[PDB]
Structures are given as C-alpha cells and as structure tokens.
Design a binder for this molecule. Structure first.
Ligand SMILES: [Cl-]
Ligand code: NA
Ligand code: NA
Length: 542
C-alpha cells in the first residue's frame, strides 16, 4: 500500500485538503444570509454533536482496512453505492470549484494597478444610478456589468466570457502540471501552501480591527438572536456548511487515511484537524465583519442591510471597503492571492484522490502504467464541463450547483454510512476493531453519538426541511420551474446510487429467498480485516 512517512506530513496535507474556499468565501455569506449570530449557535451545535464524531469514524474506517473509499465496503458488499455517491459529489464540486478559482485569478490580475478599476463611477460601463463614496455601488456594478455581463434569465445563454475562459484554462493547466510533476513530494511546497494564508489573515485582521466602527460589526457578528433559531432553514444551512467544510462525504478522507500505519493515533488527528478548520472559519469571519462594520459606520446605516445577499459578497463588499484605505492594491493582492492558494490546495488533493480511486477500482496493471493519461482525461473533461459556466448565464448555474448538487446530500450519505456500520455490521465489533487499532476503546461520548444522537438530529432536520421548502432565488430573481427540477435531479443523482447498486448486487446473489440473499449480501467478505498478516489476530486469525 505505502505509508506516509511521518505524522506531521499527514496532518499538514489533511489541513491543506480541508481548509479552502469554504472557509473564506462560502461561510461568510452563509453567515451573513442568516443574520450573523443567529447562525453561530446551530453551527457550533452541529459541529460538536455531528461533525467531529463522523470525521473520526471516517478516519478510523479508512485506517483499519488500508483501503480507499471504494475498497472499504468489503465490510458489507451490498452498501458499495456510498462510495459511488461520494465520487459523484466530488465530480460535481470539482467542476465549479475551479471556476471560483479562476474568478479569483481574474481579480488578482486586475489588482495590478496604481488605482483599482472598481473605485469610481466615471467608466464606460457605469450608469447614472452609480453612487460611490469617493444604493448602487461601483464595485457591484463592476462585478455585474463588466466582469460577468449578467443576463436576465438562466436560460439566456449569451456569449462566452473570453478572459474567464483564459483564466479557467490557466487554472486547469496549473493543477495538471502540479499533479503530474510530483510537486507534493517536496516538503517546501506543502508547508508554504498551508501556512502563508494564516500570515495573510493575521495581517488583514490587524489592519481591519483598528478601524472606526469595527466593534459594531463584531457585535453584530457575535450577538445571538434567540427568535431566529426555531426555523429549519438555518439548521439545514448550518448542517450543510459543516459537512461541506469538513469534507465528510467527499471520499478523500478515507483514501488519505488508507496510507496511515496500523497503530497510528487517528483519534487525536481528527480533533486537531476539525478544530483548526473551524477556528480558521471564525477568524475569517472576524476579518470580514470588522470592515463590514467600518463601512456601515461610514455610510451611516445599520451593520445589516449594508450589502447584498449572495456568493458575490467577497467579490463586491470587501474590495469596495478596501478602496477607502491607503495602498489599496496591496491589500487586494494579498486577499486574492490567499483565495487562490486556498482553492488550489483543495483542488490538487481532490483530483489526486479521485484518480487514485479510479485506478484502484480498475485494478489491472495496464492502467497502472497509464495513470498520467487518466489524469489528463479527467482534467480535460473537467475543463470542458466547466466551459459553459463562463457564459453570461454562468453565475445562475454555479449558484444552482452550489446550493443543490453539494448541499445536504453529504449529510444523508454520512448518516447512511454510520447506520450501516453501527446496525448491520455491529457496534460491538467496530468498538473491538478500534480498540485493536488504538489500544483503548473509543470514548463513550463518541459511542453515544454514533449510536443515537447524530442519526436522530439528521432525521429531524431532514423532515422539517422537507416540510418547509422555499424555492431558490438570487437577488429578487426567481428561478423557473425546470431549473428547480434540474436542481432536484442533481441532488438525487448521488443519493440514488445506493439503492440502485443494492438492487443490482441482490440480483446476482445466490439463494432461494429474498431474506437469504439479503443475509448473504450483507455479511463481510473473506478479505475484510487488517491488511498485514501480523495484525491478523484474535477474531481474524487463520
Ligand atoms: Cl466552515
Ligand atoms: Na474547510
Ligand atoms: Na486548501
């Protein structure tokens, strides 16, 4: 199989995988959309009671078998569709993640001037409604009428934005060249990629907490609102954000943990990684809300109702406030470089684990010697599939994919995996496996969580979210019916992998009754257990 080499290497690589654009781009506007501190309490509850336990379960389940997200299902061969669903969601996410990366590239290239181009209203693309501070903002109108050239409907496919296509091509080429040249084999690139963003965040924090009005923004960011928590929308959003940011049902955690040694302490690593991820999100929220409050104080309005709701918050509200500071291009360059690094770090690991899973599934030696060709094919397919997201209607499709194809399907898949492990295989068997691996049983908190707490919370959230369903929208724009249907189909595509594969596997099982075939297809295979022979003892001994 192959080991890692050291524990700090695995920890740093997992930090690079986990902390990305979901800490600095998606978490801020998801927190702003849910009225600040009304989002924090469900977020922390869902982190404490569902996220860390499932993170630990996934890491231990990867480490015990020395198998990836597809080969670990020898424990129950009929439930192999969980890994296929994980792969489908990974493909969905990796199509549009790199489009977000290329938009960051475009802004980084545009920041290389003495004067920022979104600072004034005296440009050809500006209208008579433009009103700057040097309400229609110059930054918003730069974003909407110059960079995107947004259409009026999702079905209005206009022209392709050539600069965005160039940025997307450059991004894909960079990722491919990093993948095929063995960049991760160097300890200077991994260290830099997962450490410099913290320096940038520290500098931005120090710059933004010394401004007049920052305390008002911080207070809005941290003050709870007890009357906006009894709604299922905020709970669903918090669950989705937690699972997306921890990368639970992506499938790469199992593949990454399959390279760990048998007696490695996987219980401490999961805690470290989860705490680091959430602390990074909170720190970025501080950084953004400080100058949100400063800008609100400048404009004379409340901390809320100062910016629009949507994924463009980091591309519109932040630079418009940066424009009011001295040496603005420096801050802009730092911000966009940090975003680019965070995105590329996650994209590299996603593609690596996906290619590894495909190659392992195919099996034969012919595909082992043609791994570069598989990587090139996957990259070409990703670029070609992301091409239509760079048109005048691209942001509609991107928002739909973000909110439907990678939202709350991860929670369902993780819950199904947990239930399958705990109730078909047996919780006592898994506890014995964990004690075999670690030398002590898992703590009772995790046992209670896995057996009772997380599935019940997920079930209640699912039920009350399904009962109360609002239709997606984007700043007073109402999506048509067929777009909502396409979003539902995208959500269902990954979930449907489980029952379909279960029926396909049942169709080829021996027996004379349905119950007999159900019993035969659910018991562990002959090769389930530890990989190495000296670890093959107790209940697995020959
Ligand atoms: Cl987060
Ligand atoms: Na994250
Ligand atoms: Na990253």
């Amino acid at each position: 199989r192959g080991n890692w080499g050291n524990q700090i290497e695995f920890v740093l690589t997992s930090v690079g995988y986990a902390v990305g654009l979901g800490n600095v781009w998606r978490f801020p506007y998801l927190c702003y959309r849910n009225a600040g501190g009304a989002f924090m309490f469900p977020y922390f509850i869902m982190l404490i009671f569902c996220g860390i336990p499932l993170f630990f379960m996934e890491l231990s389940f990867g480490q015990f078998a020395s198998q990836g997200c597809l080969g670990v299902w020898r424990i129950s061969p009929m439930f192999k569709g969980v890994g296929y669903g994980m792969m489908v969601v990974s493909t969905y996410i990796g199509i549009y993640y790199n489009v977000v990366i290329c938009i960051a590239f475009y802004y980084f290239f545009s920041s290389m001037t003495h004067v920022l181009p979104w600072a004034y209203c005296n440009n050809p693309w500006n209208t008579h409604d433009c009103a700057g501070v040097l309400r229609t903002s110059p930054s918003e109108e730069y974003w909407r009428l110059y960079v995107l050239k947004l259409s009026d409907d999702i079905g209005n496919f206009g022209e392709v934005r050539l600069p965005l296509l160039g940025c997307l091509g450059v991004s894909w080429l960079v990722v491919f060249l990093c993948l095929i040249r063995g960049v991760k084999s160097s300890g200077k690139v991994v260290y830099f990629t997962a450490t410099f963003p913290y320096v940038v965040l520290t500098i931005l924090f120090v710059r933004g907490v010394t401004l007049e009005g920052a305390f008002d923004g911080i207070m809005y960011y941290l003050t709870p609102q007890w009357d906006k928590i009894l709604a299922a929308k905020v709970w669903g959003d918090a669950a989705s954000q937690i699972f997306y940011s921890l990368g639970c049902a992506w499938g790469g955690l199992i593949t990454m943990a399959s390279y760990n040694k048998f007696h490695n302490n996987c219980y401490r690593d999961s805690v470290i990684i989860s705490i680091t991820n959430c602390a990074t999100s909170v720190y970025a929220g501080f950084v953004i809300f400080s100058i949100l409050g400063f800008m609100a104080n400048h404009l004379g309005v409340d901390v809320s109702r100062v910016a629009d709701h949507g994924p463009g918050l980091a591309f519109v509200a932040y630079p418009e406030a940066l424009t009011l500071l001295p040496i603005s291009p420096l801050w802009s360059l730092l911000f966009f470089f940090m975003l680019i690094l965070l995105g590329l770090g996650t994209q590299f690991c996603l593609l690596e684990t996906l290619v590894t899973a495909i190659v392992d599934e195919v099996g034969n030696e012919w595909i082992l010697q043609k791994k570069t060709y598989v990587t090139l094919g996957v990259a070409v397919a990703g670029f070609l599939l992301g091409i239509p997201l760079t048109s005048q209607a691209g942001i509609y499709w991107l928002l739909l994919m973000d909110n439907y194809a990678a939202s709350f399907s991860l929670v369902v898949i993780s819950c199904i995996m947990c239930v399958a492990i705990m109730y078909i295989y047996g919780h006592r068997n898994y506890f014995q496996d964990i004690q075999m691996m670690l030398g002590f049983p898992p703590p009772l908190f995790f046992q209670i969580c896995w057996r009772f707490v997380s599935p019940a919370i997920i079930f209640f959230i699912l039920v009350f979210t399904v009962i109360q369903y609002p239709i997606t929208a984007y700043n007073h724009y109402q999506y048509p019916g067929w777009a909502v249907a396409i979003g539902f189909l995208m959500a269902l595509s990954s979930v449907l992998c489980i029952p379909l594969y279960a029926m396909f596997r049942l169709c080829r099982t021996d027996g004379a009754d349905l119950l007999q075939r159900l019993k035969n297809a659910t018991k562990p295979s002959r090769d389930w257990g530890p990989a190495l022979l000296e670890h093959r003892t107790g209940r697995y001994a020959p």
